[PDB]
Structure formats: C-alpha cells, structure tokens
C-alpha cells in the first residue's frame, strides 16, 4: 500500500512547486503595479497646483476688472470736467 | 514506516501555508486593481484643471492689456488737459 | 424561486430560476448579473459538479439551495 504514497507524495511535492511558481508570479505582478500606484500622488499634486494657479488667476482677473471700471468712471469724469472747461 | 506518513502530513501543512500567502496576495491584488483603475481619471482631472487655468490666464492677459491701454488714455488727456 | 451562488471571495449573489432550467441557462444568468463569462464558471452542489446537459430537477435542487461558484481566474 506504501507504493501509492510514492505516487501520492511525489504529486504533493509537484503541487508545492506549482504553488510557489504561482506565488512568485503574483509577487512580480505586484511590483509592476506599484509603478502605477506611485503615479497616483503625482497626479493629485499636479491637480492641486493647476487648481491653485487657476484660483489665483481668477482672483487677479476680478481685482483687475473693478480696477478697470474705476479707471473708466474716472476717465469719463475727466471727459466731463474737460468739455466743460 | 510511519515516518513516511509524517512526511506527507508535513507537506500537506506546508501547502496550507502557501495557500495562505496566495489568498493574501490576491486579496491585496484586488485593492491594487482598484487604485490603478483611478489613475486615468486623475490624469483627466489634471488636464481639466490645466485647461481651466490656461483659459483664465489668457483671458486675464487680454484684460490686462486693455486696462493698460486705458491707463495710456487717461494719462494722454491728463497730458492734454494741461491747457 | 431563489437560489444562491456563493463565490470564493465572500460575495453571494441571488438568482431567480426554475427547476427546468439548464446549468448553461444558470451560467448565462450569472454572466447577466455579474459579467462572469460562462466558460470560466464551475458550479458545485452537494459535492457534485453540475453538468451542462442536466436540469435543476436532475440534481433535485430546490428553492433557496446554495451552489458554489468556482472560477478559473489565474488560479488564486
């Protein structure tokens, strides 16, 4: 009956090598995944930069606008104080 | 002898240890799949924020050029009101 | 009638079937609900693998029975 275990354990040893081969495959795939997941924070930082720079340009465009409207009313008032002069 | 069955029971226990590793690795792999799936959306966001930023900057450059011209106009008749 | 399909990942899906349905019809319903290709699906009940040519009545699968879903995804 023992010779069936030689037909048994030899299969178990072959299965352990197969499992280890699967493990080594998964570990290699994980290192390749780490490359992509390392790009995640870079893109999150880029978005924060572009969003911050946009909000700065927005605020600058607003303060510039009401500055130009103030220059307009000051100009048109000079037109009045000139044609009347 | 019975030590052969001891060799088999030992191998069976080592297979359980390997399946543990595989199950942990596949459980982690599904989480990696999720995070990697987020990358192209994050790339699209960055492209969106760059577009909105460059648009607002270009519009500001145009407005600032118009205002500076108005400054040259007010300074022109202020240089002409001298009369 | 309801039958349950438990996966190896702790997710359980509920199906509405009839005892006259084939195993291939069940695998099609699995694809419709979860996108799992039928070519990768292996369904087990009471220690026996379910065969494509048999019905639910062939295996005496009653309502609220629970089948086990084995896949083939890279051998985890």
């Amino acid at each position: 009956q023992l010779e069936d275990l030689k037909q048994q354990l030899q299969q178990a040893e072959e299965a352990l090598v197969a499992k280890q081969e699967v493990i080594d495959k998964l570990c290699e795939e994980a290192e390749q995944h780490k490359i992509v997941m390392e790009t995640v924070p870079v893109l999150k930082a880029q978005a924060d930069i572009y969003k911050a720079d946009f909000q700065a340009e927005r605020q600058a465009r607003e303060k510039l606008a009401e500055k130009k409207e103030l220059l307009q009313e000051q100009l048109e008032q000079l037109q009045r104080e000139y044609s009347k002069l | 002898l019975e030590d052969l069955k001891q060799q088999l029971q030992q191998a069976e226990e080592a297979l359980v240890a390997k399946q543990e590793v595989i199950d942990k690795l596949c459980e982690e792999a599904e989480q990696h799949k999720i995070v990697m799936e987020t990358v192209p959306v994050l790339k699209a966001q960055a492209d969106i924020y760059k577009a909105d930023f460059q648009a607002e900057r270009q519009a500001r450059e145009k407005l600032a050029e118009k205002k500076e011209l108005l400054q040259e106009q007010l300074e022109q008749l202020q240089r002409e009101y001298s009369k | 009638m309801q039958i349950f399909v438990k996966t190896l990942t702790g997710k359980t899906i509920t199906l509405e079937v009839e005892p006259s349905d084939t195993i291939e019809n069940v695998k099609a319903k699995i694809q419709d609900k979860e996108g799992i290709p039928p070519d990768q699906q292996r369904l087990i009940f009471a220690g026996k693998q379910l065969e494509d040519g048999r019905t639910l009545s062939d295996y005496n699968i009653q309502k609220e029975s629970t089948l086990h879903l084995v896949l083939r995804l890279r051998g985890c």
Partner: peptide
C-alpha cells in the same frame, strides 16, 4: 474521500488539492 472546505466538492482520498478549485485539502 474528503470534501473540499472551499467549494464542497468531494474528492478522492488520494487527492491532495481539490480537483476543481485546487485549494489544499486542509485549507
């Protein structure tokens, strides 16, 4: 014969892994 603890398939006593899900007998 032994029934697999993962997919309930009853394998032969000689089977080391489950013939279907290939997970070890004692998993």
């Amino acid at each position: 014969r032994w029934a697999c603890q993962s997919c309930t398939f009853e394998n032969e006593a000689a089977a080391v892994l489950c013939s279907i899900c290939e997970r070890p007998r004692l998993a």
